[PDB]
């Protein structure tokens, strides 16, 4: 068994990765070693039914001893340790969630259901650095894979409805907290059927502007609002790198933060390179991978499936609202949904590790 | 003074129209007549400080007696009364919020800050029917007016973040309520600083699928979610409002988000020529005093280009203006605007002022 080291497994993304792994009995084929900056020496998580102790995540020697390293610690860590190891000659595998190395020439952005061939190739060409990509690019590709995989995309226009998990656990709590600030502030009136909505709405509108609303992480309120700003914006580089395209496929738009917990939803306007019937596109998208669930353009089903409430916590990345826009049948529209913590973050790592195990 | 009749002045839109009118002393230059199927004869409100009684909303004799009629009652009413009056020869002015007549050839979709000339013209050409347009098209035009007004738009791609007010008071109440169940459910957990966020989100997500959430109006939950379906983009209305000489494609996807009154929109406008961003900003902020241009800076964008900032105001800000990677002929913009005002009542309130 190869010796695999895990960093930042306590964090949220880390937590999802562990849970997922436990679920797929990922620890069975490997030797897990756990790191932490806090209690080096204390009991080890014992996810792989293992019995050990926490190693120093900042001890180069302990890291050099590993065959593979899976970090969910962030770019601050990666930007410090990675070069120290590589420059020291360490030739082990590095699986990162942080963006820091995504654009390195000796690194590959991983998304096997989409670019497995690029991974296997690079694997054989001596690439020992694999990084997960943008939470939005990832989900977009998981959904629209069939279209890109058939060289049918000219460029992509996007508008996103991003979740709080994209910011962090703190952001997710804030959202949920503000959600209770608005309701309570009008609990009574809402209880009484004989109340004036405008009076109800004037109270919350005010509160929202008062300052009594916790906005530390977000800066501005999110509950009952949105933020057209997210602290290559859109992932054109990563998108093209993940697909190892021949020509550049423009990918631009606007990213917006909405009051969701984990799912990232996106509205697209894809300029097809050739007039393809919608049914064909339905087939193409449906085939590519088993997670790109195609939702017919019907009212009922769309409301049932194509929503965060439906996707959250699942590995499904549904595509819907597929139809040709008025600007020409060479124009396609699609709306996708997908959990950010899974395919948008950990899932790709979990599977890369499986490949190298 | 003319005799103006108000119908559905009690509903959401009406209550905003009345308040707005009271604000601008719109009742002073007219004779307000109130109707109310519910209680005919009874004591009426004292908006214009006028003493009067409530009339029968479906009393064609009482309606024929009016010079102008301002309805916020809906298409059910409009579709019943309107033809009965017109076919009876009534030649008074009809100001409607309902979409029913928007596409009639003898009707004009009103948005004076954008199509005043089209209104004045039709006014002179004997048009006595003026209707408010789509809540989205309206807001979009109020914001991107300068671009259309300069024949710089080829087509528009849109993705919307629509409020609950677009559905109704019941909706806005259902949303807030929803935000209550979610919070309560994990209220204790949220209180403990030492709680596992994945445990908190586990609960929320399960409750959201428990069916315990009241989704009568929306059908499906909205708080902590969204709905890529509205019960289409407004290409016709957009082109009619602008009385365009060539069809400017306007398409995309409309989505319902957890907001109360503001409708936000993300655009990808393809221009007919390479126009610099500074120019674009000039043309936009120039068109009207409501198209507030927000620079593409982090701080201001977060403080001004958000529902929380616009709700209840007559401002329809434009921001995130920059050329997309697909070409210098491609422009992106994000707009915000209160749906109940410019998206509903405001246009009516002002049309009435013109005819007063």
XYZ file of C-alpha atoms in Angstrom:
713
model
C 0.000 0.000 0.000
C 1.152 3.518 -0.828
C 1.557 6.016 2.013
C -0.964 8.810 1.542
C -0.851 11.998 3.593
C -3.886 14.178 4.271
C -3.736 17.874 5.091
C -6.714 20.027 6.018
C -9.042 17.037 6.466
C -10.678 18.805 9.410
C -11.793 21.731 7.281
C -15.178 21.682 5.534
C -13.903 20.546 2.136
C -11.653 18.092 3.941
C -14.641 16.796 5.929
C -16.624 16.092 2.757
C -13.633 14.322 1.242
C -13.229 12.070 4.284
C -16.953 11.279 4.501
C -17.019 10.528 0.779
C -13.957 8.322 1.090
C -15.391 6.465 4.081
C -18.486 5.947 1.957
C -16.546 4.401 -0.948
C -14.138 2.472 1.298
C -11.321 4.568 -0.199
C -8.990 4.016 2.792
C -8.871 0.254 2.265
C -6.201 0.227 -0.466
C -3.954 2.874 1.056
C -1.990 3.794 4.139
C -3.412 7.031 5.565
C -1.231 9.434 7.511
C -2.890 12.473 9.046
C -1.367 15.917 9.550
C -2.328 18.964 11.584
C -0.667 22.136 12.863
C -2.450 22.036 16.227
C -2.140 18.713 18.072
C 0.825 16.964 16.443
C 0.952 13.600 18.198
C -2.630 13.421 19.433
C -5.012 10.666 18.334
C -5.415 10.158 14.592
C -8.954 10.320 13.061
C -9.003 6.555 12.392
C -11.113 6.838 9.234
C -9.285 3.997 7.539
C -9.872 1.919 10.646
C -6.347 3.118 11.306
C -4.696 3.740 14.660
C -2.103 6.463 14.640
C -1.098 9.996 15.628
C -1.090 13.452 14.031
C 2.104 14.360 12.155
C 3.479 17.863 11.767
C 2.007 19.269 8.540
C 4.992 21.601 8.385
C 7.663 18.934 8.780
C 9.258 18.468 5.371
C 10.852 15.179 6.351
C 7.522 13.625 7.330
C 6.102 14.845 4.026
C 9.018 13.574 1.949
C 8.287 10.147 3.427
C 4.916 10.061 1.679
C 4.100 8.735 -1.782
C 1.009 10.931 -2.192
C -0.255 14.109 -0.550
C -3.890 15.232 -0.589
C -4.350 18.831 0.602
C -7.557 20.729 1.341
C -5.537 23.206 3.383
C -5.449 26.049 0.865
C -3.032 28.083 -1.231
C -1.202 29.562 1.746
C -0.016 26.084 2.689
C 0.508 24.910 -0.883
C 2.479 28.032 -1.780
C 4.830 27.373 1.137
C 5.306 23.602 1.254
C 5.021 22.561 -2.404
C 8.145 24.305 -3.733
C 10.148 23.358 -0.633
C 9.385 19.714 -1.415
C 9.834 19.804 -5.188
C 13.032 21.858 -4.940
C 14.239 19.288 -2.407
C 13.775 16.571 -5.024
C 10.540 15.011 -3.728
C 8.910 13.237 -6.659
C 5.684 12.106 -4.998
C 2.142 12.838 -6.190
C 0.512 16.097 -5.103
C -3.299 16.307 -5.196
C -4.471 19.847 -4.370
C -7.817 21.622 -4.095
C -6.217 25.078 -4.013
C -5.946 27.021 -7.278
C -2.307 28.032 -6.780
C -0.875 25.337 -9.063
C -3.737 24.976 -11.569
C -1.865 27.009 -14.189
C 1.578 25.459 -13.671
C 2.902 23.840 -16.850
C 3.866 20.681 -14.959
C 0.438 20.437 -13.304
C -2.889 19.086 -14.554
C -6.360 20.335 -13.585
C -8.270 17.162 -12.717
C -11.823 16.225 -13.721
C -11.629 12.596 -14.892
C -15.238 12.192 -16.061
C -14.282 14.945 -18.489
C -10.494 14.819 -19.019
C -9.424 11.303 -17.980
C -7.363 10.934 -21.169
C -5.458 14.135 -20.310
C -4.800 12.731 -16.850
C -3.629 9.329 -18.041
C -1.430 11.007 -20.659
C 0.181 13.394 -18.184
C 0.452 10.521 -15.727
C 2.600 8.705 -18.289
C 4.494 11.889 -19.174
C 5.715 12.251 -15.606
C 3.183 14.687 -14.146
C 3.072 14.398 -10.355
C 0.913 17.456 -9.660
C -2.881 17.308 -10.010
C -5.169 20.169 -8.990
C -8.926 20.543 -8.816
C -10.402 23.422 -10.782
C -12.845 26.309 -10.363
C -16.034 25.349 -8.528
C -17.966 26.866 -11.439
C -15.915 25.608 -14.367
C -16.039 22.127 -12.848
C -19.802 21.999 -12.479
C -20.279 23.564 -15.932
C -18.124 20.914 -17.587
C -19.724 18.081 -15.640
C -23.062 19.246 -17.070
C -22.167 20.463 -20.565
C -19.462 17.852 -21.114
C -21.176 16.209 -24.062
C -21.199 19.528 -25.930
C -17.512 20.291 -25.448
C -16.593 16.648 -25.962
C -18.096 16.927 -29.444
C -16.406 20.177 -30.428
C -19.778 21.921 -30.592
C -19.003 24.993 -28.483
C -17.880 28.322 -29.975
C -18.050 30.307 -26.749
C -20.010 30.401 -23.501
C -21.912 33.255 -21.856
C -22.672 32.740 -18.169
C -24.585 34.153 -15.225
C -24.104 32.315 -11.951
C -26.130 31.849 -8.772
C -23.393 30.840 -6.318
C -23.819 29.268 -2.880
C -22.313 30.241 0.458
C -20.297 27.024 0.741
C -18.184 28.678 -1.935
C -17.116 31.166 0.695
C -16.847 28.853 3.675
C -18.633 27.362 6.666
C -18.695 30.812 8.253
C -20.512 32.243 5.231
C -23.043 29.439 5.323
C -23.849 30.179 8.969
C -24.129 33.924 8.343
C -26.678 33.337 5.582
C -28.696 31.065 7.842
C -28.353 33.593 10.658
C -29.567 36.582 8.641
C -32.418 34.311 7.563
C -33.555 34.227 11.163
C -33.080 37.967 11.638
C -35.559 38.840 8.907
C -38.238 36.328 9.946
C -38.208 37.095 13.665
C -38.279 40.836 13.002
C -41.690 40.171 11.445
C -42.753 36.901 13.057
C -45.882 38.458 14.597
C -47.255 40.172 11.484
C -46.616 37.019 9.479
C -48.649 35.148 12.098
C -51.598 37.512 11.646
C -53.399 36.969 8.310
C -54.749 40.534 8.495
C -51.467 42.368 7.924
C -50.095 44.727 5.276
C -47.291 43.150 3.263
C -45.794 46.535 2.387
C -45.663 47.146 6.123
C -44.110 43.712 6.525
C -41.659 44.381 3.684
C -40.822 47.863 4.957
C -39.691 46.431 8.277
C -37.319 43.866 6.754
C -36.089 46.316 4.091
C -35.142 48.659 6.945
C -33.575 46.022 9.211
C -31.569 44.874 6.207
C -30.174 48.446 6.083
C -29.894 48.979 9.846
C -26.589 47.325 10.680
C -28.047 44.796 13.099
C -27.445 42.279 10.316
C -24.258 40.156 10.690
C -22.262 40.730 7.502
C -18.702 40.038 8.700
C -17.875 37.374 6.137
C -20.027 38.651 3.271
C -19.490 42.350 3.911
C -23.063 43.075 2.879
C -26.344 41.249 3.579
C -27.160 38.187 1.467
C -30.426 36.850 2.866
C -33.157 38.448 0.776
C -30.562 39.929 -1.550
C -27.618 38.929 -3.730
C -24.113 40.132 -4.531
C -22.858 40.639 -8.096
C -19.274 40.142 -6.947
C -17.076 37.228 -5.897
C -13.926 38.072 -3.933
C -10.102 34.628 -16.292
C -12.714 35.533 -13.701
C -14.954 32.993 -15.275
C -12.381 30.244 -15.751
C -11.583 30.556 -19.459
C -8.007 29.350 -18.914
C -8.954 26.468 -16.613
C -11.815 25.449 -18.896
C -9.494 25.305 -21.903
C -6.732 23.589 -19.921
C -9.042 20.933 -18.463
C -10.265 20.169 -21.984
C -6.790 20.610 -23.466
C -8.439 22.340 -26.411
C -6.811 23.081 -29.761
C -8.240 26.584 -30.073
C -9.419 28.988 -27.394
C -13.075 28.697 -26.411
C -14.226 32.028 -24.892
C -15.891 31.605 -21.514
C -17.162 34.850 -19.965
C -20.078 36.372 -18.058
C -20.999 37.476 -14.528
C -20.734 35.579 -11.240
C -23.316 36.348 -8.557
C -23.675 35.233 -4.948
C -27.148 34.045 -3.973
C -28.755 32.788 -0.773
C -28.054 29.076 -1.242
C -26.047 26.784 1.042
C -24.124 24.343 -1.185
C -25.404 24.292 -4.774
C -24.037 26.491 -7.549
C -26.552 27.138 -10.333
C -25.676 28.560 -13.748
C -27.576 30.017 -16.715
C -25.854 29.662 -20.095
C -26.110 30.974 -23.623
C -23.851 28.695 -25.642
C -23.065 29.605 -29.247
C -23.077 26.265 -31.024
C -20.535 25.788 -33.792
C -23.216 23.974 -35.805
C -27.024 23.867 -35.799
C -27.718 20.767 -33.722
C -31.287 19.658 -33.038
C -32.227 19.892 -29.367
C -33.036 16.159 -29.132
C -29.543 15.414 -30.432
C -28.119 17.801 -27.829
C -30.235 16.016 -25.226
C -28.656 12.745 -26.320
C -25.167 14.170 -26.479
C -25.406 15.668 -22.994
C -27.143 12.638 -21.496
C -24.517 10.196 -22.730
C -21.186 11.887 -21.951
C -21.380 11.032 -18.248
C -23.879 9.524 -15.755
C -24.258 12.680 -13.673
C -25.277 15.147 -16.375
C -28.961 14.413 -15.797
C -30.980 15.991 -18.607
C -34.181 17.626 -17.377
C -36.833 18.130 -20.080
C -38.021 21.686 -20.700
C -41.297 21.072 -18.845
C -42.637 23.189 -15.981
C -43.281 20.422 -13.432
C -40.086 18.389 -13.775
C -37.947 21.531 -13.967
C -39.329 22.766 -10.625
C -38.827 19.313 -9.155
C -35.296 18.535 -10.296
C -33.427 21.595 -11.547
C -33.151 23.284 -8.155
C -30.554 23.475 -5.364
C -33.071 21.929 -2.970
C -33.065 18.892 -5.260
C -29.322 18.625 -5.924
C -27.722 19.610 -2.595
C -25.680 16.750 -1.173
C -25.894 14.634 -4.330
C -23.406 13.871 -7.112
C -25.946 14.870 -9.769
C -25.165 17.810 -12.051
C -28.438 18.280 -14.025
C -28.885 20.297 -17.227
C -32.206 21.794 -18.272
C -34.075 24.600 -20.006
C -32.444 23.511 -23.240
C -33.831 25.333 -26.281
C -32.678 27.545 -29.166
C -32.674 31.272 -28.455
C -34.245 33.907 -30.726
C -30.852 35.151 -31.914
C -30.607 32.095 -34.153
C -30.717 28.264 -33.976
C -26.932 28.398 -33.620
C -27.630 29.684 -30.093
C -28.415 27.346 -27.219
C -29.549 28.034 -23.677
C -29.135 25.801 -20.644
C -29.503 26.003 -16.888
C -27.437 23.752 -14.653
C -27.277 22.888 -10.968
C -24.623 21.091 -8.934
C -23.349 20.709 -5.389
C -20.204 22.827 -4.946
C -18.584 20.766 -2.196
C -18.629 17.555 -4.251
C -17.848 17.749 -7.981
C -16.987 21.397 -7.471
C -14.385 20.610 -4.830
C -13.582 17.199 -3.303
C -14.990 14.543 -5.635
C -12.283 15.102 -8.275
C -9.575 14.692 -5.610
C -11.100 11.542 -4.132
C -11.083 9.906 -7.573
C -7.592 11.055 -8.561
C -6.323 9.416 -5.379
C -8.153 6.219 -6.331
C -6.293 6.165 -9.660
C -2.880 6.489 -8.004
C -3.618 4.081 -5.142
C -60.512 68.735 -13.048
C -60.935 65.395 -14.815
C -62.727 62.481 -13.262
C -60.298 59.642 -12.632
C -61.461 56.224 -11.498
C -59.256 53.796 -9.578
C -59.743 50.034 -9.513
C -57.656 47.565 -7.521
C -56.123 50.465 -5.595
C -56.371 48.150 -2.591
C -54.085 45.397 -3.858
C -50.296 45.365 -3.663
C -49.601 47.447 -6.782
C -52.505 49.743 -5.988
C -51.246 50.361 -2.464
C -47.873 51.331 -3.943
C -49.482 53.511 -6.594
C -51.636 55.305 -4.008
C -48.736 55.875 -1.612
C -46.552 57.130 -4.472
C -49.355 59.415 -5.649
C -49.888 60.755 -2.139
C -46.138 61.387 -2.063
C -46.175 63.432 -5.277
C -49.505 65.155 -4.583
C -50.944 63.493 -7.707
C -54.510 63.590 -6.342
C -54.642 67.413 -6.260
C -55.206 67.988 -9.985
C -57.887 65.327 -10.392
C -61.224 64.059 -9.129
C -60.568 60.654 -7.525
C -63.324 58.060 -7.841
C -62.886 54.783 -5.962
C -64.445 51.430 -6.837
C -64.667 48.270 -4.739
C -66.811 45.238 -5.594
C -66.474 44.319 -1.931
C -68.270 47.295 -0.403
C -70.160 49.505 -2.831
C -71.527 52.736 -1.369
C -69.490 52.610 1.850
C -67.020 55.286 2.982
C -63.997 55.741 0.705
C -60.397 56.738 1.610
C -59.247 60.346 1.990
C -56.139 60.346 -0.205
C -56.719 63.556 -2.124
C -58.497 64.741 0.997
C -61.683 64.328 -1.002
C -64.908 63.090 0.546
C -66.450 60.313 -1.489
C -67.962 56.832 -1.497
C -66.841 53.526 -3.038
C -68.402 52.704 -6.409
C -69.259 49.387 -8.092
C -66.194 48.124 -9.970
C -68.390 46.501 -12.641
C -70.946 49.320 -12.948
C -70.504 50.236 -16.613
C -72.681 53.342 -16.181
C -70.426 54.586 -13.404
C -67.353 53.755 -15.482
C -68.626 55.471 -18.626
C -68.966 58.609 -16.502
C -65.194 58.745 -16.011
C -62.609 60.477 -18.184
C -59.770 58.179 -17.097
C -59.557 54.735 -15.521
C -56.503 53.408 -13.681
C -56.676 49.666 -12.981
C -54.403 47.494 -10.865
C -57.143 44.891 -10.696
C -55.732 42.425 -13.212
C -56.462 40.853 -16.584
C -59.604 39.082 -15.388
C -61.211 42.464 -14.784
C -59.683 44.160 -17.806
C -60.702 41.300 -20.114
C -64.307 41.691 -18.961
C -64.882 45.431 -18.581
C -62.616 46.959 -21.231
C -64.384 45.596 -24.330
C -67.812 46.213 -22.803
C -66.861 49.888 -22.471
C -65.106 50.341 -25.808
C -67.830 48.447 -27.688
C -70.302 50.727 -25.933
C -68.530 53.739 -27.416
C -66.644 54.915 -24.316
C -63.692 56.968 -25.523
C -62.006 57.692 -22.199
C -58.390 56.911 -21.271
C -57.567 53.435 -19.961
C -54.365 53.027 -17.919
C -53.754 49.337 -17.118
C -51.094 47.351 -15.255
C -52.358 44.012 -16.615
C -50.680 42.562 -19.715
C -53.936 41.700 -21.500
C -53.914 44.765 -23.762
C -50.152 45.298 -24.137
C -50.151 43.776 -27.630
C -53.338 45.425 -28.902
C -52.675 47.545 -31.991
C -54.634 50.456 -30.534
C -52.741 50.277 -27.231
C -49.331 51.586 -26.186
C -46.968 50.023 -23.635
C -45.982 52.919 -21.373
C -42.516 53.784 -20.059
C -42.133 57.537 -20.615
C -38.504 57.901 -19.485
C -37.844 55.532 -22.382
C -40.651 55.987 -24.930
C -42.242 59.374 -24.166
C -42.174 60.306 -27.862
C -44.101 57.119 -28.684
C -46.646 58.071 -26.041
C -47.016 61.671 -27.185
C -47.352 60.509 -30.788
C -49.998 57.902 -30.040
C -51.695 60.419 -27.757
C -52.023 62.680 -30.803
C -53.034 59.761 -33.016
C -56.062 58.995 -30.861
C -54.711 56.239 -28.613
C -56.777 55.980 -25.430
C -55.277 52.725 -24.122
C -51.958 52.706 -22.233
C -50.566 49.619 -20.508
C -47.545 48.984 -18.328
C -45.124 46.357 -19.587
C -43.204 43.296 -18.391
C -41.604 43.780 -14.981
C -38.274 42.666 -16.458
C -38.330 44.459 -19.819
C -39.260 47.635 -17.972
C -36.385 47.490 -15.526
C -33.959 46.454 -18.285
C -34.911 49.430 -20.433
C -34.819 51.855 -17.528
C -31.219 50.736 -16.966
C -29.911 50.113 -20.489
C -31.940 52.903 -22.072
C -28.930 54.883 -23.240
C -27.697 51.888 -25.247
C -30.977 51.254 -27.053
C -31.594 54.976 -27.436
C -28.369 55.156 -29.443
C -29.057 52.180 -31.698
C -26.115 50.303 -30.184
C -27.816 46.990 -29.388
C -27.747 43.985 -31.742
C -29.342 41.519 -29.336
C -29.587 40.854 -25.604
C -28.824 37.687 -23.637
C -30.304 37.599 -20.140
C -30.352 35.664 -16.891
C -32.691 37.006 -14.231
C -32.844 36.915 -10.442
C -36.540 37.671 -9.853
C -38.213 38.680 -6.590
C -41.303 37.290 -4.880
C -43.260 40.522 -5.309
C -43.406 39.413 -8.925
C -45.670 36.618 -7.791
C -47.691 38.449 -5.173
C -47.965 39.380 -1.508
C -48.683 35.735 -0.707
C -45.377 34.785 -2.303
C -43.339 37.413 -0.469
C -44.899 36.117 2.734
C -44.286 32.478 1.814
C -40.580 33.234 1.236
C -39.993 34.978 4.545
C -41.974 32.271 6.309
C -39.742 29.661 4.660
C -36.633 31.490 5.923
C -38.203 30.955 9.326
C -38.479 27.174 9.205
C -34.926 26.846 7.956
C -33.473 29.010 10.730
C -35.591 27.586 13.539
C -34.854 23.967 12.613
C -31.133 24.574 13.328
C -31.483 27.555 15.676
C -29.792 25.779 18.583
C -26.989 24.455 16.380
C -26.372 27.954 14.971
C -26.118 29.122 18.608
C -23.270 26.760 19.483
C -19.993 28.106 18.101
C -18.754 24.503 18.220
C -21.199 23.005 15.722
C -20.377 20.984 12.616
C -21.546 23.036 9.622
C -22.163 19.788 7.707
C -24.520 18.672 10.470
C -26.361 21.993 10.304
C -26.611 21.885 6.523
C -27.627 18.230 6.748
C -30.744 19.166 8.736
C -31.646 22.186 6.579
C -31.342 20.134 3.431
C -33.478 17.312 4.801
C -36.159 19.665 6.121
C -36.210 21.263 2.678
C -37.276 17.849 1.366
C -39.485 16.859 4.292
C -42.524 18.595 2.805
C -42.970 20.410 6.097
C -42.190 23.652 4.262
C -45.255 25.613 3.067
C -44.918 25.917 -0.721
C -48.516 26.565 -1.755
C -47.857 29.628 -3.904
C -44.404 28.677 -5.184
C -45.061 24.956 -5.549
C -41.500 24.211 -4.461
C -39.285 25.754 -1.754
C -37.560 29.059 -2.532
C -35.706 29.994 0.656
C -32.204 28.598 0.267
C -32.951 27.607 -3.311
C -34.177 29.073 -6.591
C -36.552 28.168 -9.413
C -35.541 28.270 -13.084
C -39.145 28.782 -14.117
C -41.627 31.642 -14.090
C -45.352 30.954 -14.382
C -41.188 34.917 -22.406
C -38.269 37.309 -22.119
C -40.244 40.160 -23.637
C -38.800 40.534 -27.130
C -42.096 41.815 -28.527
C -42.752 44.260 -25.700
C -39.155 45.463 -25.769
C -39.373 46.178 -29.491
C -42.830 47.721 -29.201
C -41.867 50.000 -26.307
C -38.908 51.216 -28.347
C -40.904 51.198 -31.574
C -37.873 49.660 -33.273
C -37.418 49.559 -37.044
C -35.698 46.159 -36.825
C -36.297 43.257 -34.422
C -33.621 43.305 -31.704
C -33.469 39.748 -30.266
C -34.043 39.581 -26.524
C -33.733 36.077 -25.033
C -32.344 34.125 -22.080
C -33.536 32.466 -18.866
C -35.718 33.868 -16.065
C -35.078 32.571 -12.546
C -36.889 33.097 -9.243
C -34.639 33.952 -6.305
C -35.194 34.622 -2.611
C -35.663 38.403 -2.822
C -38.709 40.418 -1.770
C -39.137 43.269 -4.289
C -36.061 43.796 -6.459
C -35.499 42.111 -9.810
C -31.823 41.756 -10.736
C -30.539 40.905 -14.213
C -27.237 39.834 -15.770
C -26.748 40.761 -19.431
C -24.486 39.987 -22.337
C -25.293 42.656 -24.909
C -23.766 42.311 -28.369
C -23.111 45.785 -29.749
C -23.080 46.851 -33.401
C -19.688 48.529 -33.085
C -16.754 48.718 -30.684
C -17.814 51.355 -28.178
C -15.433 52.114 -25.312
C -16.585 51.420 -21.754
C -16.304 55.089 -20.701
C -18.574 55.965 -23.642
C -21.045 53.264 -22.649
C -21.105 54.645 -19.100
C -21.750 58.123 -20.499
C -24.642 57.090 -22.727
C -26.221 55.039 -19.945
C -26.020 57.533 -17.073
C -27.128 60.201 -19.553
C -30.432 58.644 -20.674
C -32.139 59.228 -17.325
C -31.559 60.097 -13.621
C -32.562 56.580 -12.528
C -29.958 54.649 -14.519
C -27.298 55.030 -11.848
C -23.973 53.783 -13.223
C -21.972 51.833 -10.653
C -18.234 51.602 -11.427
C -16.748 48.118 -11.797
C -15.134 48.279 -8.339
C -15.569 45.692 -5.580
C -16.602 48.014 -2.740
C -19.194 50.211 -4.467
C -20.653 47.248 -6.358
C -21.363 45.480 -3.054
C -22.803 48.631 -1.491
C -24.999 49.811 -4.369
C -25.717 47.090 -6.971
C -27.810 44.903 -4.641
C -31.526 44.431 -3.889
C -30.890 45.461 -0.290
C -29.720 48.797 -1.678
C -32.424 49.353 -4.301
C -35.587 47.968 -2.666
C -38.187 50.693 -2.227
C -36.315 53.237 -4.347
C -36.816 54.528 -7.898
C -33.181 53.830 -8.761
C -32.399 51.313 -11.500
C -28.560 50.945 -11.308
C -26.286 49.454 -13.983
C -22.914 47.927 -13.117
C -20.249 45.334 -13.914
C -19.801 46.994 -17.291
C -16.874 45.571 -19.250
C -16.087 43.874 -22.563
C -16.325 40.089 -22.573
C -13.626 37.756 -23.912
C -15.689 36.895 -26.990
C -14.944 40.275 -28.539
C -14.960 44.088 -28.038
C -18.417 44.006 -29.606
C -19.608 42.163 -26.500
C -20.698 44.005 -23.384
C -21.747 42.728 -19.978
C -23.912 44.497 -17.426
C -25.721 43.722 -14.203
C -28.793 45.710 -13.227
C -31.065 46.011 -10.202
C -34.470 47.621 -9.780
C -37.549 47.516 -7.576
C -40.292 45.534 -9.328
C -43.234 47.263 -7.655
C -42.179 50.748 -8.734
C -40.731 51.120 -12.230
C -41.631 47.506 -12.855
C -45.296 48.063 -12.040
C -46.911 51.272 -10.738
C -44.526 54.148 -11.441
C -45.243 54.104 -15.197
C -48.994 54.306 -14.497
C -48.673 57.135 -11.961
C -46.797 59.224 -14.539
C -49.074 58.424 -17.471
C -51.958 59.679 -15.349
C -50.041 62.879 -14.631
C -49.669 63.494 -18.375
C -53.406 63.151 -19.009
C -54.486 65.080 -15.898
